[PDB]
Short mmCIF file of C-alpha atoms in Angstrom, two decimals:
data_model
loop_
_atom_site.label_atom_id
_atom_site.label_comp_id
_atom_site.label_asym_id
_atom_site.label_seq_id
_atom_site.Cartn_x
_atom_site.Cartn_y
_atom_site.Cartn_z
CA UNK A 575 10.28 -46.90 30.90
CA UNK A 576 9.46 -47.50 27.22
CA UNK A 577 12.16 -45.30 25.66
CA UNK A 578 13.70 -48.10 23.61
CA UNK A 579 14.34 -46.22 20.37
CA UNK A 580 16.12 -43.04 21.47
CA UNK A 581 17.61 -40.11 19.58
CA UNK A 582 18.82 -36.57 20.19
CA UNK A 583 18.89 -33.17 18.49
CA UNK A 584 21.45 -30.43 19.20
CA UNK A 585 20.89 -27.01 17.64
CA UNK A 586 24.33 -25.44 17.30
CA UNK A 587 24.89 -21.90 18.65
CA UNK A 588 24.98 -19.30 15.88
CA UNK A 589 24.15 -15.59 15.51
CA UNK A 590 21.48 -16.21 12.86
CA UNK A 591 18.72 -17.21 15.31
CA UNK A 592 18.23 -17.64 19.07
CA UNK A 593 18.22 -21.01 20.86
CA UNK A 594 14.49 -20.64 21.49
CA UNK A 595 14.13 -19.55 17.85
CA UNK A 596 16.11 -22.59 16.66
CA UNK A 597 14.04 -24.85 18.93
CA UNK A 598 10.80 -23.36 17.59
CA UNK A 599 12.01 -23.77 13.99
CA UNK A 600 12.95 -27.41 14.64
CA UNK A 601 9.62 -28.08 16.38
CA UNK A 602 7.64 -26.50 13.54
CA UNK A 603 9.62 -28.45 10.94
CA UNK A 604 9.03 -31.67 12.89
CA UNK A 605 5.30 -30.95 13.24
CA UNK A 606 5.03 -30.18 9.52
CA UNK A 607 7.20 -33.05 8.19
CA UNK A 608 6.46 -35.75 10.78
CA UNK A 609 2.68 -35.66 11.29
CA UNK A 610 2.04 -34.53 7.72
CA UNK A 611 1.03 -38.00 6.50
CA UNK A 612 -0.09 -38.93 10.02
CA UNK A 613 1.58 -41.53 12.22
CA UNK A 614 1.24 -43.03 15.68
CA UNK A 615 4.61 -43.10 17.48
CA UNK A 616 6.07 -39.64 18.10
CA UNK A 617 7.79 -38.77 21.37
CA UNK A 618 9.60 -35.44 21.74
CA UNK A 619 10.74 -34.75 25.31
CA UNK A 620 13.40 -32.34 26.52
CA UNK A 621 16.61 -34.36 26.02
CA UNK A 622 18.61 -31.44 27.48
CA UNK A 623 15.83 -29.86 29.51
CA UNK A 624 16.11 -27.86 32.73
CA UNK A 625 12.80 -26.61 34.16
CA UNK A 626 14.39 -24.77 37.11
CA UNK A 627 15.99 -21.75 35.37
CA UNK A 628 12.78 -20.86 33.46
CA UNK A 629 14.17 -22.12 30.12
CA UNK A 630 11.76 -24.55 28.46
CA UNK A 631 13.90 -25.65 25.52
CA UNK A 632 17.63 -25.61 24.80
CA UNK A 633 18.14 -29.17 23.48
CA UNK A 634 16.08 -31.82 21.72
CA UNK A 635 15.67 -35.53 22.48
CA UNK A 636 13.45 -37.89 20.48
CA UNK A 637 12.16 -41.15 21.99
CA UNK A 638 10.32 -42.72 19.05
CA UNK A 639 9.89 -46.13 17.42
CA UNK A 640 12.11 -47.94 14.91
CA UNK A 641 9.88 -47.70 11.83
CA UNK A 642 8.61 -44.29 13.00
CA UNK A 643 12.17 -42.95 12.67
CA UNK A 644 13.16 -45.02 9.63
CA UNK A 645 10.42 -43.24 7.64
CA UNK A 646 9.90 -40.04 9.69
CA UNK A 647 13.32 -38.46 9.07
CA UNK A 648 13.74 -38.62 5.26
CA UNK A 649 11.55 -35.81 3.90
CA UNK A 650 12.01 -32.18 2.82
CA UNK A 651 9.85 -31.04 5.75
CA UNK A 652 12.70 -32.20 8.04
CA UNK A 653 15.78 -31.51 5.89
CA UNK A 654 16.80 -28.26 4.20
CA UNK A 655 17.72 -26.22 7.29
CA UNK A 656 20.30 -28.72 8.62
CA UNK A 657 23.11 -26.12 8.57
CA UNK A 658 22.34 -24.91 12.11
CA UNK A 659 21.49 -28.14 13.94
CA UNK A 660 22.70 -31.65 13.04
CA UNK A 661 21.30 -35.11 12.37
CA UNK A 662 20.64 -37.81 14.97
CA UNK A 663 21.82 -41.26 15.99
CA UNK A 664 19.99 -44.33 17.33
CA UNK A 665 20.42 -45.60 20.88
CA UNK A 666 18.96 -48.58 22.72
CA UNK A 667 16.76 -48.32 25.81
CA UNK A 668 18.51 -49.16 29.10
CA UNK A 669 17.07 -50.60 32.31
CA UNK A 670 16.80 -47.08 33.78
CA UNK A 671 13.55 -45.70 32.35
CA UNK A 672 11.71 -43.01 34.35
CA UNK A 673 7.99 -42.63 33.59
CA UNK A 674 8.21 -39.08 32.24
CA UNK A 675 4.95 -38.92 30.29
CA UNK A 676 5.63 -36.05 27.86
CA UNK A 677 2.60 -34.70 25.99
CA UNK A 678 1.63 -32.15 23.34
CA UNK A 679 -1.44 -30.34 24.71
CA UNK A 680 -2.64 -26.84 25.63
CA UNK A 681 -3.29 -24.87 28.81
CA UNK A 682 -5.65 -22.15 30.03
CA UNK A 683 -4.59 -18.78 28.64
CA UNK A 684 -7.74 -16.82 27.68
CA UNK A 685 -8.27 -13.61 29.70
CA UNK A 686 -11.28 -12.67 27.58
CA UNK A 687 -12.08 -15.94 25.76
CA UNK A 688 -14.74 -16.73 28.37
CA UNK A 689 -16.63 -13.64 27.18
CA UNK A 690 -16.43 -14.87 23.57
CA UNK A 691 -17.61 -18.32 24.67
CA UNK A 692 -20.52 -16.82 26.63
CA UNK A 693 -21.49 -14.62 23.68
CA UNK A 694 -21.29 -17.53 21.21
CA UNK A 695 -22.76 -20.51 23.08
CA UNK A 696 -23.20 -19.53 26.74
CA UNK A 697 -25.58 -16.55 27.12
CA UNK A 698 -23.42 -14.97 29.84
CA UNK A 699 -22.59 -11.40 30.85
CA UNK A 700 -19.85 -10.33 28.45
CA UNK A 701 -19.01 -7.14 30.35
CA UNK A 702 -18.33 -9.00 33.61
CA UNK A 703 -16.34 -11.60 31.65
CA UNK A 704 -14.22 -8.85 30.08
CA UNK A 705 -13.71 -6.94 33.34
CA UNK A 706 -13.04 -10.18 35.29
CA UNK A 707 -9.57 -10.58 33.74
CA UNK A 708 -7.03 -9.65 36.45
CA UNK A 709 -3.36 -10.60 36.75
CA UNK A 710 -4.37 -13.26 39.30
CA UNK A 711 -7.00 -14.67 36.92
CA UNK A 712 -4.83 -16.39 34.30
CA UNK A 713 -3.44 -19.76 35.43
CA UNK A 714 -1.01 -21.01 32.78
CA UNK A 715 2.34 -22.82 32.72
CA UNK A 716 4.59 -20.66 34.90
CA UNK A 717 7.40 -23.22 34.45
CA UNK A 718 9.33 -23.54 31.17
CA UNK A 719 6.50 -24.48 28.79
CA UNK A 720 8.08 -23.49 25.47
CA UNK A 721 5.41 -22.33 23.01
CA UNK A 722 6.91 -22.38 19.52
CA UNK A 723 4.36 -20.06 17.91
CA UNK A 724 3.82 -18.78 14.38
CA UNK A 725 3.44 -15.33 12.82
CA UNK A 726 -0.31 -14.93 13.28
CA UNK A 727 -0.79 -13.44 16.78
CA UNK A 728 1.33 -10.75 18.41
CA UNK A 729 1.09 -12.35 21.85
CA UNK A 730 4.19 -14.25 22.95
CA UNK A 731 4.48 -18.03 23.40
CA UNK A 732 2.90 -19.33 26.60
CA UNK A 733 2.82 -22.92 27.84
CA UNK A 734 1.90 -25.70 25.40
CA UNK A 735 3.05 -29.05 26.79
CA UNK A 736 1.88 -32.08 28.80
CA UNK A 737 4.71 -32.88 31.21
CA UNK A 738 4.72 -35.80 33.62
CA UNK A 739 6.22 -36.73 36.99
CA UNK A 740 9.90 -37.76 36.93
CA UNK A 741 10.34 -40.76 39.24
CA UNK A 742 11.37 -44.43 39.08
CA UNK A 743 7.94 -45.57 37.83
CA UNK A 744 6.56 -46.33 34.35
CA UNK A 745 3.89 -44.39 32.45
CA UNK A 746 3.29 -44.79 28.70
CA UNK A 747 0.41 -43.62 26.53
CA UNK A 748 -0.84 -43.00 23.02
CA UNK A 749 1.18 -40.74 20.74
CA UNK A 750 -0.63 -38.24 18.53
CA UNK A 751 0.03 -36.84 15.04
CA UNK A 752 2.29 -34.07 16.38
CA UNK A 753 4.89 -35.83 18.54
CA UNK A 754 3.37 -35.96 22.01
CA UNK A 755 1.65 -38.29 24.48
CA UNK A 756 -2.06 -38.64 25.23
CA UNK A 757 -1.70 -40.48 28.53
CA UNK A 758 2.03 -41.05 28.74
CA UNK A 759 5.27 -41.18 26.79
CA UNK A 760 8.62 -42.97 26.46
CA UNK A 761 11.49 -42.77 28.98
CA UNK A 762 13.85 -39.87 29.58
CA UNK A 763 17.44 -40.34 30.73
CA UNK B 56 56.44 8.11 16.91
CA UNK B 57 52.91 7.97 18.34
CA UNK B 58 49.35 7.22 17.30
CA UNK B 59 47.37 9.62 15.14
CA UNK B 60 44.76 11.40 17.24
CA UNK B 61 42.12 11.24 14.46
CA UNK B 62 41.69 8.38 11.99
CA UNK B 63 38.68 7.85 9.75
CA UNK B 64 38.41 5.18 7.06
CA UNK B 65 35.71 5.26 4.42
CA UNK B 66 33.99 1.92 4.06
CA UNK B 67 34.52 -0.37 1.11
CA UNK B 68 32.01 -2.91 -0.27
CA UNK B 69 29.14 -0.42 -0.26
CA UNK B 70 25.73 -2.13 -0.69
CA UNK B 71 22.32 -0.79 -1.62
CA UNK B 72 19.05 -1.70 0.05
CA UNK B 73 17.24 -4.98 -0.52
CA UNK B 74 14.06 -4.54 -2.56
CA UNK B 75 11.99 -7.56 -1.53
CA UNK B 76 9.36 -8.71 -4.00
CA UNK B 77 7.43 -11.95 -4.48
CA UNK B 78 6.55 -14.37 -7.23
CA UNK B 79 6.13 -18.00 -8.25
CA UNK B 80 8.95 -20.52 -8.69
CA UNK B 81 10.11 -21.48 -12.22
CA UNK B 82 9.16 -18.04 -13.52
CA UNK B 83 12.46 -16.52 -12.34
CA UNK B 84 13.59 -15.87 -15.94
CA UNK B 85 11.31 -12.81 -16.18
CA UNK B 86 11.41 -11.60 -12.57
CA UNK B 87 11.48 -7.88 -13.34
CA UNK B 88 7.79 -6.98 -12.94
CA UNK B 89 7.09 -9.00 -9.80
CA UNK B 90 4.92 -7.23 -7.20
CA UNK B 91 6.53 -6.03 -3.99
CA UNK B 92 5.87 -7.29 -0.48
CA UNK B 93 3.71 -4.58 1.09
CA UNK B 94 3.87 -3.93 4.83
CA UNK B 95 0.31 -4.07 6.20
CA UNK B 96 -1.28 -3.93 9.65
CA UNK B 97 -3.36 -6.25 11.84
CA UNK B 98 -3.72 -7.23 15.51
CA UNK B 99 -2.82 -3.02 19.69
CA UNK B 100 -1.20 -2.61 16.26
CA UNK B 101 1.61 -4.59 14.64
CA UNK B 102 3.07 -4.47 11.14
CA UNK B 103 3.15 -7.76 9.22
CA UNK B 104 4.68 -8.74 5.88
CA UNK B 105 3.37 -11.76 3.95
CA UNK B 106 3.22 -13.21 0.44
CA UNK B 107 0.49 -12.95 -2.23
CA UNK B 108 -2.05 -15.74 -2.54
CA UNK B 109 -0.57 -17.15 -5.77
CA UNK B 110 3.09 -16.66 -4.85
CA UNK B 111 5.66 -18.85 -3.10
CA UNK B 112 9.02 -17.29 -4.06
CA UNK B 113 10.85 -14.34 -2.53
CA UNK B 114 13.12 -12.07 -4.57
CA UNK B 115 15.77 -9.94 -2.83
CA UNK B 116 17.72 -7.60 -5.12
CA UNK B 117 20.54 -5.18 -4.34
CA UNK B 118 23.75 -3.80 -5.85
CA UNK B 119 27.29 -3.73 -4.49
CA UNK B 120 30.13 -1.33 -5.33
CA UNK B 121 33.67 -2.57 -4.69
CA UNK B 122 35.87 0.50 -4.27
CA UNK B 123 39.52 -0.15 -3.58
CA UNK B 124 42.13 1.94 -1.82
CA UNK B 125 41.74 0.01 1.41
CA UNK B 126 44.60 1.50 3.43
CA UNK B 127 44.52 5.27 3.10
CA UNK B 128 42.64 7.14 5.86
CA UNK B 129 40.28 9.97 5.01
CA UNK B 130 41.47 12.07 7.97
CA UNK B 131 44.83 11.82 9.73
CA UNK B 132 46.71 14.34 11.87
CA UNK B 133 50.18 12.80 11.73
CA UNK B 134 52.25 12.67 8.56
CA UNK B 135 54.58 9.94 9.88
CA UNK B 136 51.84 7.62 11.11
CA UNK B 137 50.03 8.06 7.80
CA UNK B 138 52.78 6.93 5.44
CA UNK B 139 53.95 4.36 8.01
CA UNK B 140 50.43 2.89 7.80
CA UNK B 141 50.52 3.17 4.00
CA UNK B 142 53.78 1.25 3.71
CA UNK B 143 52.60 -1.37 6.23
CA UNK B 144 49.40 -1.98 4.23
CA UNK B 145 51.51 -1.96 1.04
CA UNK B 146 53.64 -4.72 2.59
CA UNK B 147 50.43 -6.64 3.27
CA UNK B 148 49.29 -6.14 -0.32
CA UNK B 149 52.54 -7.14 -2.01
CA UNK B 150 53.48 -10.18 0.08
CA UNK B 151 50.03 -11.70 -0.60
CA UNK B 152 46.98 -10.50 -2.48
CA UNK B 153 43.51 -9.68 -1.26
CA UNK B 154 42.45 -13.12 -2.55
CA UNK B 155 42.00 -14.69 0.90
CA UNK B 156 39.70 -11.99 2.30
CA UNK B 157 38.10 -11.60 -1.14
CA UNK B 158 37.57 -15.36 -1.30
CA UNK B 159 35.69 -15.19 1.99
CA UNK B 160 33.62 -12.19 0.81
CA UNK B 161 32.79 -14.05 -2.41
CA UNK B 162 31.71 -17.01 -0.28
CA UNK B 163 29.38 -14.78 1.73
CA UNK B 164 27.96 -13.59 -1.59
CA UNK B 165 27.88 -17.18 -2.86
CA UNK B 166 25.44 -18.46 -0.26
CA UNK B 167 22.55 -16.32 0.94
CA UNK B 168 23.61 -15.00 4.35
CA UNK B 169 22.08 -11.62 3.52
CA UNK B 170 18.86 -13.54 3.88
CA UNK B 171 18.70 -13.69 7.67
CA UNK B 172 15.56 -15.49 8.81
CA UNK B 173 13.98 -15.87 5.36
CA UNK B 174 16.51 -18.67 4.75
CA UNK B 175 15.70 -20.92 7.73
CA UNK B 176 13.72 -23.82 6.31
CA UNK B 177 13.82 -22.98 2.61
CA UNK B 178 13.31 -25.53 -0.13
CA UNK B 179 15.51 -23.92 -2.79
CA UNK B 180 17.51 -20.69 -2.75
CA UNK B 181 19.56 -19.55 -5.75
CA UNK B 182 21.88 -16.54 -5.64
CA UNK B 183 22.30 -14.92 -9.06
CA UNK B 184 25.11 -12.40 -9.57
CA UNK B 185 25.70 -10.29 -12.67
CA UNK B 186 28.68 -8.10 -13.53
CA UNK B 187 27.85 -4.56 -14.64
CA UNK B 188 30.33 -2.44 -16.59
CA UNK B 189 27.74 -0.55 -18.62
CA UNK B 190 23.99 -1.16 -18.83
CA UNK B 191 24.58 -4.77 -19.95
CA UNK B 192 25.60 -7.96 -18.17
CA UNK B 193 29.30 -8.60 -18.77
CA UNK B 194 29.41 -11.91 -16.85
CA UNK B 195 26.58 -13.92 -15.26
CA UNK B 196 27.00 -16.26 -12.29
CA UNK B 197 24.45 -18.68 -10.82
CA UNK B 198 24.76 -20.51 -7.52
CA UNK B 199 22.88 -22.72 -5.06
CA UNK B 200 22.94 -21.37 -1.53
CA UNK B 201 21.96 -24.60 0.24
CA UNK B 202 24.77 -26.56 -1.41
CA UNK B 203 27.41 -24.02 -0.38
CA UNK B 204 27.84 -24.22 3.37
CA UNK B 205 27.59 -21.65 6.13
CA UNK B 206 30.15 -22.81 8.72
CA UNK B 207 32.96 -23.89 6.35
CA UNK B 208 34.68 -22.39 3.31
CA UNK B 209 35.22 -24.44 0.15
CA UNK B 210 36.42 -24.12 -3.45
CA UNK B 211 34.87 -24.00 -6.92
CA UNK B 212 35.59 -22.42 -10.32
CA UNK B 213 32.91 -19.73 -10.53
CA UNK B 214 33.48 -18.83 -6.87
CA UNK B 215 37.18 -18.38 -7.59
CA UNK B 216 36.32 -16.22 -10.62
CA UNK B 217 34.06 -14.05 -8.44
CA UNK B 218 36.77 -13.89 -5.77
CA UNK B 219 39.32 -12.82 -8.38
CA UNK B 220 36.91 -10.07 -9.46
CA UNK B 221 36.44 -8.86 -5.87
CA UNK B 222 40.20 -8.96 -5.29
CA UNK B 223 40.79 -6.86 -8.41
CA UNK B 224 38.17 -4.42 -7.15
CA UNK B 225 39.68 -4.10 -3.68
CA UNK B 226 43.18 -3.34 -4.96
CA UNK B 227 42.24 -0.55 -7.36
CA UNK B 228 42.79 -2.45 -10.62
CA UNK B 229 39.33 -1.64 -11.96
CA UNK B 230 35.71 -0.77 -11.26
CA UNK B 231 33.38 -3.55 -10.11
CA UNK B 232 29.61 -3.18 -9.87
CA UNK B 233 27.67 -6.34 -9.05
CA UNK B 234 23.93 -6.85 -8.73
CA UNK B 235 22.75 -9.71 -6.51
CA UNK B 236 19.42 -11.57 -6.70
CA UNK B 237 18.40 -14.31 -4.23
CA UNK B 238 15.30 -16.30 -5.13
CA UNK B 239 13.80 -18.44 -2.37
CA UNK B 240 11.07 -20.91 -1.43
CA UNK B 241 8.85 -20.42 1.63
CA UNK B 242 5.25 -21.27 0.79
CA UNK B 243 1.95 -20.13 -0.67
CA UNK B 244 1.25 -17.09 1.48
CA UNK B 245 3.63 -17.44 4.44
CA UNK B 246 5.44 -14.75 6.43
CA UNK B 247 8.65 -12.92 5.50
CA UNK B 248 10.89 -10.99 7.87
CA UNK B 249 11.99 -7.46 6.98
CA UNK B 250 14.10 -5.34 9.31
CA UNK B 251 12.30 -3.56 12.13
CA UNK B 252 12.41 0.19 12.72
CA UNK B 253 12.15 2.08 16.00
CA UNK B 254 6.37 -2.43 15.66
CA UNK B 255 7.28 -0.83 12.33
CA UNK B 256 8.80 -2.67 9.36
CA UNK B 257 11.35 -0.89 7.19
CA UNK B 258 10.01 0.30 3.86
CA UNK B 259 10.58 2.44 0.76
CA UNK B 260 7.98 3.73 -1.74
CA UNK B 261 5.50 0.86 -1.19
CA UNK B 262 7.96 -2.03 -0.75
CA UNK B 263 9.26 -3.83 2.32
CA UNK B 264 13.03 -3.78 2.54
CA UNK B 265 16.17 -4.56 4.57
CA UNK B 266 18.70 -2.02 5.85
CA UNK B 267 21.99 -1.80 3.98
CA UNK B 268 24.06 -2.05 7.15
CA UNK B 269 22.35 -5.40 7.79
CA UNK B 270 23.53 -6.75 4.43
CA UNK B 271 26.91 -5.21 5.21
CA UNK B 272 26.97 -7.11 8.50
CA UNK B 273 26.09 -10.25 6.56
CA UNK B 274 29.07 -9.59 4.26
CA UNK B 275 31.79 -8.94 6.88
CA UNK B 276 30.92 -12.24 8.62
CA UNK B 277 34.32 -13.78 7.96
CA UNK B 278 36.78 -14.34 10.79
CA UNK B 279 37.22 -17.95 11.87
CA UNK B 280 40.43 -17.10 13.73
CA UNK B 281 38.82 -16.30 16.97
CA UNK B 282 40.39 -19.55 18.18
CA UNK B 283 37.96 -20.46 20.96
CA UNK B 284 35.29 -22.53 19.20
CA UNK B 285 34.38 -23.48 15.61
CA UNK B 286 30.88 -24.59 16.62
CA UNK B 287 29.69 -21.03 16.06
CA UNK B 288 31.51 -20.92 12.73
CA UNK B 289 32.55 -17.42 11.71
CA UNK B 290 31.37 -14.14 13.23
CA UNK B 291 31.27 -10.50 12.14
CA UNK B 292 34.56 -8.68 11.68
CA UNK B 293 34.61 -5.77 14.15
CA UNK B 294 37.04 -4.68 16.90
CA UNK B 295 36.43 -6.28 20.30
CA UNK B 296 34.75 -9.01 18.27
CA UNK B 297 31.35 -9.32 19.86
CA UNK B 298 27.83 -10.63 19.30
CA UNK B 299 24.93 -8.79 20.91
CA UNK B 300 22.47 -11.66 20.46
CA UNK B 301 24.92 -14.04 22.12
CA UNK B 302 25.58 -11.28 24.65
CA UNK B 303 29.17 -12.43 25.20
CA UNK B 304 32.31 -11.00 23.63
CA UNK B 305 35.42 -12.91 22.61
CA UNK B 306 38.62 -11.24 21.26
CA UNK B 307 39.05 -9.04 24.32
CA UNK B 308 41.98 -6.78 25.25
CA UNK B 309 42.60 -9.27 28.06
CA UNK B 310 44.47 -11.41 25.57
CA UNK B 311 46.14 -9.79 22.58
CA UNK B 312 43.78 -10.63 19.72
CA UNK B 313 42.40 -7.06 19.70
CA UNK B 314 42.34 -4.94 16.55
CA UNK B 315 43.79 -1.99 18.46
CA UNK B 316 46.64 -3.94 20.06
CA UNK B 317 47.60 -5.76 16.85
CA UNK B 318 47.39 -2.50 14.88
CA UNK B 319 49.61 -0.73 17.43
CA UNK B 320 52.18 -3.52 17.39
CA UNK B 321 52.24 -3.95 13.61
CA UNK B 322 52.22 -0.25 12.68
CA UNK B 323 54.21 1.42 15.45
CA UNK B 324 56.51 -1.18 17.01
CA UNK B 325 56.84 -3.28 13.78
CA UNK B 326 55.74 -6.44 15.62
CA UNK B 327 54.53 -8.47 12.65
CA UNK B 328 51.72 -10.77 13.86
CA UNK B 329 50.53 -14.08 12.47
CA UNK B 330 49.05 -14.03 8.96
CA UNK B 331 45.51 -14.73 10.16
CA UNK B 332 45.54 -11.85 12.64
CA UNK B 333 46.68 -9.47 9.91
CA UNK B 334 43.86 -10.80 7.69
CA UNK B 335 41.56 -9.71 10.53
CA UNK B 336 43.27 -6.29 10.75
CA UNK B 337 42.96 -5.64 7.01
CA UNK B 338 39.33 -6.77 7.17
CA UNK B 339 38.70 -4.14 9.85
CA UNK B 340 40.42 -1.54 7.66
CA UNK B 341 38.13 -2.53 4.77
CA UNK B 342 35.21 -2.13 7.21
CA UNK B 343 36.25 1.40 8.17
CA UNK B 344 35.29 3.37 11.24
CA UNK B 345 36.44 5.98 13.71
CA UNK B 346 39.88 5.14 15.09
CA UNK B 347 42.51 6.95 17.13
CA UNK B 348 42.46 8.36 20.65
CA UNK C 798 32.34 19.78 -6.19
CA UNK C 799 31.34 16.11 -6.42
CA UNK C 800 33.20 15.30 -3.22
CA UNK C 801 32.46 11.66 -2.45
CA UNK C 802 29.99 11.33 -5.34
CA UNK C 803 32.86 10.78 -7.80
CA UNK C 804 34.97 8.43 -5.66
CA UNK C 805 34.59 5.16 -7.53
CA UNK C 806 32.26 6.00 -10.41
CA UNK C 807 31.92 4.64 -13.93
CA UNK C 808 31.83 7.95 -15.80
CA UNK C 809 31.68 11.55 -14.59
CA UNK C 810 31.09 14.43 -16.97
CA UNK C 811 30.62 18.14 -16.37
CA UNK C 812 28.80 20.16 -19.03
CA UNK C 813 28.81 23.95 -18.65
CA UNK C 814 26.49 26.46 -20.31
CA UNK C 815 27.07 30.20 -20.70
CA UNK C 816 23.88 32.17 -20.07
CA UNK C 817 23.43 35.62 -21.64
CA UNK C 818 19.62 35.80 -21.75
CA UNK C 819 17.34 32.82 -21.16
CA UNK C 820 19.41 31.13 -23.84
CA UNK C 821 22.67 29.16 -23.99
CA UNK C 822 25.19 31.40 -25.75
CA UNK C 823 28.09 28.92 -25.61
CA UNK C 824 28.08 25.31 -24.39
CA UNK C 825 30.90 23.08 -23.18
CA UNK C 826 31.12 19.38 -22.33
CA UNK C 827 33.95 17.64 -20.51
CA UNK C 828 35.17 14.30 -19.18
CA UNK C 829 35.96 14.73 -15.49
CA UNK C 830 37.77 11.39 -15.22
CA UNK C 831 40.04 11.95 -18.23
CA UNK C 832 40.99 15.39 -16.92
CA UNK C 833 43.20 14.75 -13.93
CA UNK C 834 43.14 16.01 -10.37
CA UNK C 835 46.86 16.46 -9.58
CA UNK C 836 48.09 18.57 -12.51
CA UNK C 837 46.82 21.55 -14.52
CA UNK C 838 47.27 20.67 -18.19
CA UNK C 839 46.22 22.81 -21.14
CA UNK C 840 43.40 22.22 -23.63
CA UNK C 841 41.61 24.24 -26.30
CA UNK C 842 38.12 24.52 -24.82
CA UNK C 843 39.65 24.80 -21.34
CA UNK C 844 41.46 27.89 -22.59
CA UNK C 845 38.19 29.18 -24.06
CA UNK C 846 36.42 28.74 -20.70
#
């Protein structure tokens, strides 16, 4: 509903990295060279998203502000690797604005982190917390929640997103220092 | 006349392994004693390569022999197919030089495509190339791999000098030995990608490294005349021209862009193809491999 | 005997020692690239060997 300043990002297909790898590289570059000095308005929804085939990211769409894009796209934390993807263009916000509140948050993924929490500041049974981790115990994003991770943990990327309901309503909220929404986002369409 | 039942071409453009080390930027003028990137272990067990605490610059060094004699097979049953192939490749060499294919190989040396995922998001990458005739640099080139593109092919003066050197090496006019150094910029203690073994990272005597067939794949990435789409740029020169990461395969024997079909028509039946398709055929002959039925 | 290890090399030489006791009785030294591979041409130390 409030996707006035709109932009897109298309990572071109090449044999030097996967589409999820290119999306993770673009997301890490945006999180390092967009919320480096801070900021308020950052909206990064799936501009070419399809959450039915289990693919969380294969296209980028930015719904940000005017001054947030006039000074948030001219740094070396964004440029440099522009030989795979391309630049963007500005577009106005139409009357059709679905309230797709896109966020940048986490989800429950610890199958033994409850035991660490009980040992640190809980005083709970750590053996039952370790043995209480079945396949039907973890409840994370089973839809395409693309987790662009780093080279610190061997475990693969689970869900890290705050998606909203796509309808004909309006829902906007406060953007964080990483390109998300803390109660809503800009439009998507 | 028929096809030779056994063909075998020795490869040209024979690279050595990539000895990855690490250092600090603007000390590249004395980058001989830089410490190597050591493969270590952390967590199940994985192998992880990193940078030192006071380092932010990768160094990837290898050498490259350019051989020449790019038409003669190393094993051939027929004596009519063999000299028919020799005179066909001699027609290719005398009507135009190697300078087109060698220009594209010098472009793949000019940028840093032998850096695979240690290039993505780099601040500055410089590809230094020296010419070695004895133990002394006979000609020194310096580049900038982010200025020179990856999906298009352009012109320069030093790139044309390097392409002339590669074209003299591929024809048999001399002996060319080049050493290649690619400095980079990643960050103060970030992660570098070596090549994985059958996880296990590839190594030598206490140094992470890259396989030589990987750098060879990054050098035979030439052909733009798969005419379907230029959004992917160029791909690797190989028959039934295919990408395993893409999973698809263009240049099929469905249409007649195949190496085998073009080679059969241009050697046996004297059907001279377009100039770009014969550039592809001579690039496959420079690649080498096991041919024949 | 250098089969592929001489194909495209800078300089190849073959030096040959004659061993009587644990001692070189007569030494030679050649240039394997100057000496051809298609013809058998004469030389002084080649005739000695």
